[PDB]
Design a protein around this ligand. Structure first.
Ligand SMILES: [Mg+2]
Lengths: 83, 97, 94, 110, 83, 97, 94
DNA sequence: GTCCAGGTTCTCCCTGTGGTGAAAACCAACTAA
């Protein structure tokens, strides 16, 4: 199923609100075309590592431990969902 | 009456460093995964605890990026982050080759 | 079927140093998955300590070296001495 | 016929984490071929010291913000408050936590 | 055996020459008290992990594969000496 | 005759990015390990391929540090590295807690 | 005693694509230790693929997934198809 | 100093989560060699 224009779903306040959690007061208007780029790099290195686990067990559902196993691979461990 | 610039901003920093809420909303982040997954294998399903395993891992990366971005902006005698900071934030950690 | 866990054995530690304290469901799973991860770091470094010294045997010496590697500084001083109490108490029994 | 009283090996060492369950997770995890009888004793103690040390610190942050139960925010905040607990989990995201409250003291208002 | 004043053995040109390999043209005079600090942090996290291997086999010589096993642990693999 | 500042310096960058030699010498780095090893266990021996396993790993870290230091110095509109750069280089990677 | 190695099997690959080329001693040990490291990454990810799917068996399917994880991009396209030739040639024999 | 804005505390009602009590299931420990 194909639904495009959804890198533009990461809206303009929801990058500002993520900026405020990092402790950032004033931002530019050109982070919005940088953040959406660095985000899709990070999801093209997790979903590419997650699907090769789900294809390997011949599952059609990328389950909760799969993503945690992908994040185990990169060296960014996620607790709380298992694994 | 009229706030100065940097007053409503600093109210946001102590606000969002206290809550645990979702900042990136669900459905405009769930559909982002339905773009990258289409290349590697079409017709995949996702458990909602696995999408949420990404919504709490992508927000675990940008906040880890912006807090390491804002070190650079302060470092150049500024208080404003710029996209020359992020592209030099990532080159130091090795998060982009 | 059966999912083994460490959830029950947290309440037997939570009610040791904070006896008037509950713990939520989604915070149990962190201390659940803290255990399973810190399990296989210590085991999976004691495992690779067996090949490095050509033995097929995980002793209770090899778990001690695979805790002085993973734990840094002041945890490596306590969690060693918090194990050798529980072994010397164990072996004097039975 | 009957047999003696089955005394568990977790009660023969004064621990709370089991040793019977740990000793079949060293022979079904392919860590090595032989696993000593004292090794899952010694490992269930180190699993028990470190399970206290988070929950000791997770009890305080629950108390300092007037809570009965420990939600993951406290586990998020008990970690990264202690220094040596943070250096163990320096790479590790905890789910549903957010970060510590932090300002670099240059963004303070003028 | 005790030989002190040997964090001062990392001399002033030999930090400049390491700076030139990184592609650095102009340096300050206050890197020299920073580099010797960051260096001894890195050798108090390798020798502390190397000696626990050599003590474990009850060897008195920290051999070549020991250090490589310590650098295996941190996630900085060293080829060329074995392991 | 008289070189300008930045000319003999740039001769060094293309020089040392070509060779494979040892920059930190052997004996003033071998004795550095005879200070840190004395704490954890006195009277240890070292194989010379293990000291060299450190002399090619410590030089593998500073060069990885200074090349990520010099990104910051260029980032603050400068060409000079400073010890506020390194202490902010290491905080981004997480190499110091 | 005996140190097993991959040094001999480099000359049987070096003399395949550069037949007029020698190789030094201290550069052999890199391509020696390149192999032993890239061995246990692929094995040690196929190993942990056995536990994740509850099988005691390393098949030749599990080595294929533990090469599509470690090798990035265009090496993951060739080294898969440079293995399935050497298996289909192998199984049609014997 | 002064006025107000957005916040923090206190209380009351409501819900969801947790801590537990009871059966089943399975593993751990004991026994004989
Ligand atoms: Mg008989």
């Amino acid at each position: 199923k194909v639904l495009r224009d959804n890198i533009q779903g990461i809206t303009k306040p929801a990058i500002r609100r993520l900026a405020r959690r990092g402790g950032v007061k004033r931002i530019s208007g050109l982070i919005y075309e940088e953040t959406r780029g660095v985000l899709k790099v990070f999801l093209e290195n997790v979903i590419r590592d997650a699907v090769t686990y789900t294809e390997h067990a011949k599952r059609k559902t990328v389950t909760a431990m799969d993503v945690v196993y992908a994040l185990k691979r990169q060296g960014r461990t996620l607790y709380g969902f298992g694994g | 009456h009229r706030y100065r610039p940097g007053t409503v901003a600093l109210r946001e920093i102590r606000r969002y460093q206290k809550s645990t809420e979702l900042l990136i909303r669900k459905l405009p982040f769930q559909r982002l995964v339905r773009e990258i997954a289409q290349d590697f294998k079409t017709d995949l399903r996702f458990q909602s605890a696995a999408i949420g395993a990404l919504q709490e891992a992508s927000e675990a990366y940008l906040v880890g990026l912006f807090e390491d971005t804002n070190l650079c902006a302060i470092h150049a005698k500024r208080v404003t982050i710029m996209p020359k900071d992020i592209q030099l934030a990532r080159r130091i950690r090795g998060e982009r080759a | 079927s059966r999912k083994e866990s460490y959830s029950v054995y947290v309440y037997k530690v939570l009610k040791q140093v904070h006896p008037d304290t509950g713990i939520s469901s989604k915070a149990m799973g962190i201390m659940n998955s803290f255990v399973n991860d810190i399990f296989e770091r210590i085991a999976g470094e004691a495992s690779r300590l067996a090949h490095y010294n050509k033995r097929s045997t995980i002793t209770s010496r090899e778990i001690q070296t695979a805790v002085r590697l993973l734990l840094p500084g002041e945890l490596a001083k306590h969690a060693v001495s918090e194990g050798t109490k529980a072994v010397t108490k164990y072996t004097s029994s039975k | 016929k009957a047999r003696a009283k089955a005394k568990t090996r977790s009660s023969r060492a004064g621990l709370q984490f089991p040793v019977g369950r740990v000793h079949r997770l060293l022979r079904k995890g392919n860590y090595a071929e032989r696993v000593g009888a004292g090794a899952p004793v010694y490992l269930a103690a180190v699993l028990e010291y470190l399970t206290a040390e988070i929950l000791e610190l997770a009890g305080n942050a629950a108390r300092d913000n007037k809570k009965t139960r420990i939600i993951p925010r406290h586990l998020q905040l008990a970690i990264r408050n202690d220094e040596e607990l943070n250096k163990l989990l320096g790479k590790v995201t905890i789910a549903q936590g957010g970060v510590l409250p932090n300002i670099q003291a240059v963004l303070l208002p003028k």
